[PDB]
Write a protein that binds this ligand. Structure first.
Ligand code: ORN
Ligand code: ORN
Ligand code: CL
Ligand code: K
Ligand code: K
Lengths: 358, 379, 358, 379
C-alpha cells in the first residue's frame, strides 16, 4: 500500500494519476488476501486500524462524497470504498466508479458486513469461534475494540483468555516444497507455527519505522540496520521487526530473524510473547516505535536504552519546560492558550513575532 | 456449519469446510504448487485415486470453463484448499468452483492449514488420507478409510482410466481469439500417430495435432500386433495415473515396437514405460513432483526449462541400460527427467511438454518427435 | 397507488405522514406484482410511463437527493427507488432507508436492470422473445420507446408485428374455481383470453379519467356513468374503461363490460382492437381521455361526438380566438409573449391588470 | 435457460421454467386456491401421486421452514406455479422454495398460465399429467407418461404412505412465542388414542395432543384385534391420498370398532372409510376440493365455517344408511361434509379441522371427539 503525505502540500492536487505522488510504502503478508490487506492497513502509519470510517452514516451528503472519492481516487480511496458498502452501495455500484476488480471488492464488502455484526453483538458476542474468524480475516484488536466499544487491551485479554494467538509462517520461495534455514516470518491465524525460537541466546529486537514518510525516512532505517549489524556481530541474536519492502532492514540478511510485520503494539507484543527477548530497541525507527514505547513497557516489554518516561519528559512540552527550568537553561518564552483573545494578550507578554502551533 | 474433515494415515486431522459434494474421499494425498491452473489440474487423469492439495491459498478466483478441462471428467479423488473466494472474476468463467465440484460430485474441503499439510508430506512423504464432508464427519471413520486404502504402489491405474474403444482425434490447440478450434479433416493432417491412452491429457493431443498429426487413440492394453497393422507414422505414450510397473501389457507392447524402426515417444507414465521396456527400473518418489515452477536441464544443451510436473514415481538413473542415455535432469533434486534410446528413435520426458496448467518451455520436445517421424517417412 | 396534488399547494409540507394528503388513487390488476405495479404507474395520470427517472445519472449530487427522498418520503418516492438502483444502491441500502420490504424492492431493482438492457440493445435488440418478456413485466410501449429512443408507435407497431398482444382475464372472487357470467376484465400477457367479445350488439366505449385529482373529480365519473346507464338502457352494449377503485364507474353493475385498465392509448387501443366498438366517448372523463382523442382517432378509433378537432379548436388559444373574431364576439385583450421585455410593452397595450398564464 | 414442460392426458401443453429437480413427474393434476400455506400443502401426504398447481401467482414469498412441514417429506408429485418470486422474505424462512424443492427432489415448473389450467380442470375435470424438466423436454414423451398413468380412481395410496411400524405421538401445537413444543411425557396426557395412519398430517396429531391425547400411530393395515388389545380411549382415522374404497383392511377393521362402544373419529379419508364402514358408497369428484376458503355448513347448528379442503373423492349422500346422519354440507356444491352414526359414538368430517394451511374455524370438531372419550371412560 502506498504512503502519501498530501497533508504537507495542501495546495497540491491530491488526486491519484500516472505521475507518482506517494512518498513511501508498506507491505504485508497474509495467508489470505483479507488478512494480507488488513495487516497492511494497520501497518501504514496513518492511524488506521483497518477500515476505519471516513464519513458519518447519518451524514446526508455522505453518499455524495463517497461517490466522489471513488470516481476520482485520492489517497483515501480505500477507506471510502468501505464506507460505500456501509452506506448501501453495491459491489457493482462501486466497480463502476472505480474499475477495481470485483474479486477484491467482494472481500472488502464481507469485512464490512462482519464489522456490522461485531458492532451489533458487541463484546458479549465475541466468542472464541467468532473472534477467531475475525482474527483470521485480519481484524486488528484495535479495530474490534472500537466496534465493540471497548479498549484495545480488552480484546487483547479476550484473546489471551481464549488462547487465540497467531502462528508464524516462513518465506521460502517455494510454497514449502523445500525446507528453509532462513527465519523470514509473517503472522497468521493458522495451526502450525514455524517460529521455533531459540532458548539458546540473548536476543535483541529492533523496531522499524514502517513505511517511509516525509520526516521519517531512510535515516531511521539506517540506524535500525546498524543496531542489528553491531549487536549480531557482538554475539546477540538480532530480531528485526519491520514492513517496509524498500529497505535494507527488511533484507533477511540484515538480522538473525526477520518478522515482516506491522510495527504495532499488537503485532509486536505477539512476537515478544514467543521470543521473550532480552531487550527491545524502540529509539531507532522514528516516530513509529517511539509511540509504542510506553505501552510496550506497561505490557512488560524489556525496553532497553532511554526509558519511555525519559522520552516523554523530553517530548512533553510541559514536562520539558521543567527540566530546563531546573537546569537553568534558556528557552524561548511561551504560553499555552485556550482561547483567541487569551493568546492576543498572552502574546504581548511573549512578544512577536510568534510561532503558533496547534 | 457445513463441515468437512480430512484425516491422514498418520491420524493427523484438518478440520475445515465442505465446498464440493457430500461424501467421503480416499486416496493418496499430494500437493501441487501451481499458482494458476487448478481446473486443468482437476481434470488430469493422472490424478486418479489422488487427493489434491493446492499450496496457493486462493483457489477458484477465475471460476471454471470447458476449455480449461484436460479430460472429460474430474480425475482427482478430492480437493483440499485454504480458501474458496467469495466470487469468481474472469471473462472466461462459466461456473464457479464449488458448483463445478458439486457437479462433478467432488468431495472438497476448504479452510485448512494447507501449509501445515505440505510441510508434512514433504517431511514425512506421501500419505493416504480421507476427506469426509457432511453433517457429522466421523474422524475415527476417516482414519479408518485412510488406513484401509490399498496404496498407489503397484497399482495399475492406467487400465482403469483408459478409453473403452479406440478413436480418432484431429483437434488442435486453443487460441485466445478462436478458443477451441474445429477438429481438422483427416487429409489435412500429414502424419498419423497412434496414441496409447494411459489416461491422456487433451493438450498433448491438441499439441500433436498442431504439428500436423492425425491421431488414433487406443486403449492401454492394445497389442503391438494390432497397432502395427495401422502402419503408424509414430507411436505415442501418454501420461496417466498410478504405477507403471504393473502395466505388463504396456511394457510388452512397447518392447515390441522397440524391435521396429518406428519413432516412439512418451510423456510422464509413457516415459516410465519406455524405460521399463528398455531395462530400466522405476521407483516411487517420497512425495514426487507436482507443480509448475520445476527447473529441468537439457543436459545436452545445458539449458534450463521451467516445467509442469505431475508424478509420484520415477525412473532410476543408476539402473539404466546402456542403450539408454540421460537427456534431462531435475534442478530441484536431480532426479531423472529425460531419456533417449542410443540404439533407437525412441525417447521420453518425465515432465509435460504440453504442460496445460503451466510454462510452455518444454514444448519443443514435441518437435524432436516430429523430426523423427518425418525422417522415418523418408524411409 | 395514491394520487397527490402538492404542486397546487406550494407552501405545504409535502412529506408523507400519518395525516393523509392524497387527493385520489389508481388501482391496477396484473398477474404478477411487477406487471400490476407497472400498470398502476402508467395509469396514475402523472405523466409516468412506468419508472421514469427523476434524477440524472450524471448528477453528482443525485445520490444526496435520492437518499433524502427515500429516507423521508414524498409523493415521488416510488420513482426515486428506481433511480437509487440505477445509481448503484443496493436493495439492503434502500431497505434501510425506507423500511419497504425487500420482497417488493428486489422486483423493482429487477425491472431497473431490464431497463438497462433495453437501453443497451435498443430497438434492434427487441426481439419477439425479449419483447414478450418485457410486456409480461408490465412495461409500457411508451417506456420501452423512451429506453430504445423511439416513438411509442414503433413499439406498438413492432408488437403487432409479432402478434404480441395481451389477453384478458376476468375477476371472479374465486381463482377461477367457479364460472363467471360477469365481464370485469384486466389485461395481461398470458395464454388464454377470456374476453369473448360479442358480435351481436352495437358497442359504445366509455373512457374514464383514472385517479381523482383536484379539478378532475367525481363530477367526470358521474357523466361517464350516466353515459353508460343511458346507453345500456338504450340497447347498446356499453363498455367502460377506467381504473379508479373509488368510483361507481368501476362497479361491475355500471356497464355491460368493464375493462379495469389504465386509461392510456396503449391500453385503450388493445381493447378497441378486439371490441370493435361502434363509438368511443372521450369527452366525459375529463382531461385524461380528452388528451387521447387525437391519437385514438388517428389510429382508426371511432370516436363519437364533438370531434377531436373541434375540441382542439376551442382548446387551442389561437384556433379559438379566430372563431371568436369570426363570430364577432367579445374576448379580453390578449397577447402571446416570448420575452421578459416583450411583455412589458404588450402589457402596456392590453392594459393592467393582467392575467399572466405561463 | 432451464426448460420445463407440462403435458396433460388431453394433449394440452404448458411451456415454462424449471424451478425444482430435473426429471419427470406423473400424476393427477389438481388446482389449489390457497393464497398461503404452500409448504404445508406440499408436505401433505394426501397429495401423493398428484401434481399440484397453485392458483395464487407468487409461490415461495416466504421461503420455507421445518415448522411448516406436515409430514416427513414432500408428497406432492410435482408443483405448478405462475411465479417463483425473486427472494423469500420472512423472518421464519430457512430456505428458498427452489432450494427446498431441489432438496426434496421435486420436479416443479413456473411461468405458466395457471389460470388457463385451472379453468380447464374446472370445466373438463381432473386430468393426469406429466412434467418434464430438463434440457430438451420431450413433449410426446410426457404425453405418453400422462396417458399411461393408471389414474387414482381405485388406487390405494394409504398403504403406500403409511408407517411401517406403530409408534407413539405426544407432541403439541406450535406457537409464535415458543415454536414447536417439546414432546410431552406419557404421564402428562390423560387419553390414549390410537390413530390409524392412512397418511397422517402432523397438525392433526399435534392438535390432539393439544387436547390431552397420547397417541399411537399404527400402520394402516393394523388389525382391529391388535388394536383393541391396546385398550384405547379413542380411535382416530387419519387423512391420506388415493381412493378410500380399495382399502379393504380399513373398512373391515373399522366395522369391527363399530361393534364396540369405543369412540371413533375420522378426518377426510378417515371420514370416507367410516362411511364405507357404515355401508355408504364413495364417488370420485369432478375436480375435487382443494383450497382454504371453502364454506361448510353445520346443518344442525346452521352455521358456516370457512374451511381447508383437500379431497378428490366424496361420500354419496343418497346411499347413506339410516345409521348415518348428515352433519355438514358444502356451501359451494352441496357435497357431503360430515356424518354421524346415529347408533354409535362415531363421526367424521370431510374438511380439515386441523387445517394446517387454513382457517381454524373447524377445530371444534375436535372437541366433540374429546367429549365422547370422556364419556366412554366414565363407562
Ligand atoms: N521453521 C523452523 C525450522 C525450519 C526447518 N528447517 C524446516 O524447513 O522444516
Ligand atoms: N370468459 C367468458 C366467460 C365464460 C364462462 N362462463 C367462464 O367463466 O368460463
Ligand atoms: Cl403544510
Ligand atoms: K480450519
Ligand atoms: K410461458
Amino acid at each position: 500500500i502506498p504512503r502519501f503525505n498530501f497533508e504537507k502540500f495542501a495546495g497540491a492536487n491530491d488526486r491519484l494519476t500516472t505521475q507518482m505522488k506517494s512518498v513511501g510504502e508498506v507491505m504485508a503478508i497474509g495467508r489470505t488476501q483479507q488478512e494480507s490487506l488488513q495487516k497492511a492497513l494497520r501497518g501504514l502509519e496513518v492511524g488506521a486500524t483497518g477500515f476505519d470510517p471516513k464519513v458519518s452514516l447519518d451524514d446526508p451528503e455522505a453518499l455524495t462524497k463517497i461517490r466522489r472519492e471513488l470516481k476520482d481516487a485520492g489517497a483515501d480511496r480505500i477507506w471510502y470504498i468501505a464506507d460505500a458498502f456501509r452506506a448501501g452501495l453495491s459491489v457493482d455500484g462501486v466497480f463502476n466508479l472505480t474499475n477495481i476488480d470485483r474479486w477484491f471488492l467482494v472481500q472488502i464488502e464481507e469485512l464490512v458486513r462482519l464489522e456490522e455484526k461485531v458492532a451489533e453483538v458487541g463484546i458479549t458476542g465475541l466468542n472464541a469461534d467468532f473472534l477467531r474468524q475475525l482474527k483470521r480475516k485480519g481484524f486488528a484488536d484495535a479495530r474490534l475494540a472500537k466496534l465493540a466499544g471497548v479498549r484495545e487491551a480488552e480484546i487483547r485479554k479476550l484473546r489471551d483468555q481464549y488462547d487465540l494467538h497467531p502462528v508464524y509462517k516462513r518465506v521460502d520461495t517455494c510454497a514449502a516444497e523445500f525446507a528453509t534455514d532462513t527465519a523470514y516470518m509473517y503472522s497468521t491465524y493458522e495451526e502450525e507455527c514455524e517460529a521455533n525460537p531459540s532458548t539458546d541466546r540473548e536476543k535483541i529486537m529492533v523496531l522499524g519505522g514502517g513505511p517511509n514518510r516525509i520526516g521519517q525516512g531512510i535515516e531511521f532505517d539506517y540506524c535500525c540496520v546498524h543496531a542489528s549489524l553491531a549487536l549480531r556481530e557482538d554475539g546477540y541474536e538480532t530480531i528485526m521487526v519491520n514492513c517496509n519492502p524498500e529497505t535494507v532492514s527488511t533484507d533477511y540478511d540484515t538480522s538473525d530473524r526477520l518478522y515482516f510485520e506491522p510495527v504495532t503494539l499488537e503485532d509486536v507484543l505477539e512476537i515478544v510473547r514467543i521470543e521473550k527477548p532480552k531487550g527491545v530497541i524502540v529509539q531507532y525507527g522514528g516516530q513509529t516505535p517511539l509511540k509504542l514505547a510506553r505501552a510496550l513497557e506497561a505490557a512488560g516489554v524489556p525496553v532497553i536504552g532511554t526509558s519511555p518516561d525519559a522520552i516523554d519528559r523530553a517530548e512533553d512540552r510541559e514536562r520539558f519546560q521543567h527540566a530546563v527550568e531546573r537546569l537553568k537553561l534558556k528557552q524561548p518564552a511561551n504560553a499555552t492558550v485556550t482561547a483567541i483573545e487569551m493568546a492576543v494578550e498572552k502574546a504581548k507578554e511573549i512578544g512577536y513575532p510568534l510561532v503558533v502551533r496547534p | 456449519i457445513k463441515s468437512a474433515l480430512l484425516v491422514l494415515e498418520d491420524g493427523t486431522q484438518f478440520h475445515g469446510r465442505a465446498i464440493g459434494a457430500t461424501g467421503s474421499a480416499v486416496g493418496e494425498v499430494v500437493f501441487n504448487t501451481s499458482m494458476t491452473g487448478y481446473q486443468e489440474i482437476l481434470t488430469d487423469p493422472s490424478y486418479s485415486r489422488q487427493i489434491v492439495t493446492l499450496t496457493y491459498p486462493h483457489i477458484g478466483n477465475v471460476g471454471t470453463n470447458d476449455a480449461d478441462e484436460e479430460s472429460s471428467q474430474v480425475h482427482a479423488q478430492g480437493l483440499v484448499i485454504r480458501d474458496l473466494p467469495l466470487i469468481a472474476s474472469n471473462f472466461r468463467n462459466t461456473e464457479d468452483l464449488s458448483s463445478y465440484l458439486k457437479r462433478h460430485n467432488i468431495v472438497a474441503i476448504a479452510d485448512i492449514d494447507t501449509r501445515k499439510l505440505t510441510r508434512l508430506l514433504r517431511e514425512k512423504g506421501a500419505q493416504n488420507g480421507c476427506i469426509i464432508a457432511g453433517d457429522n464427519p466421523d474422524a475415527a471413520l476417516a482414519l479408518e478409510k485412510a488406513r484401509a486404502f490399498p496404496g498407489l504402489n503397484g497399482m495399475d491405474l492406467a487400465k482403469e482410466v483408459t478409453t473403452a474403444e479406440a478413436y480418432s482425434w484431429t483437434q488442435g490447440s486453443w487460441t485466445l481469439t478462436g478458443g477451441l478450434p474445429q477438429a481438422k479433416k483427416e487429409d489435412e493432417l500429414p502424419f498419423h500417430v497412434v496414441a496409447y491412452d494411459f489416461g491422456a491429457k487433451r493438450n498433448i493431443l491438441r499439441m500433436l495435432v498442431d504439428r500436423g498429426c492425425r491421431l488414433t487413440i487406443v486403449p492401454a492394453q492394445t497389442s503391438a500386433e494390432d497397432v502395427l497393422k495401422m502402419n503408424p507414422d509414430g507411436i505415442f505414450l501418454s501420461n496417466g495415473p498410478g504405477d507403471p510397473a504393473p502395466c505388463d501389457y504396456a511394457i510388452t507392447a512397447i518392447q515390441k515396437f522397440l524391435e521396429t524402426d518406428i519413432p516412439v515417444f512418451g510423456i510422464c507414465l509413457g516415459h516410465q514405460l519406455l524405460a521399463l521396456a528398455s531395462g530400466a527400473k522405476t521407483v516411487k518418489m517420497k512425495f514426487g513432483h507436482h507443480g509448475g515452477n520445476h527447473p529441468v536441464k537439457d543436459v545436452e544443451k545445458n539449458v534450463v526449462m521451467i516445467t509442469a510436473q505431475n508424478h509420484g514415481f520415477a525412473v532410476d538413473e543408476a539402473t539404466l541400460p546402456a542403450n539408454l542415455r540421460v537427456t534431462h535432469k531435475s534442478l530441484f533434486d536431480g532426479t531423472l527427467q529425460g531419456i533417449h534410446r542410443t540404439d533407437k528413435p525412441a525417447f521420453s520426458f518425465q515432465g509435460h511438454p504440453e504442460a496445460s496448467p503451466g510454462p510452455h518451455d518444454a514444448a519443443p520436445l514435441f518437435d524432436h518427435f516430429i523430426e523423427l517421424i518425418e525422417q522415418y517417412r523418408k524411409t
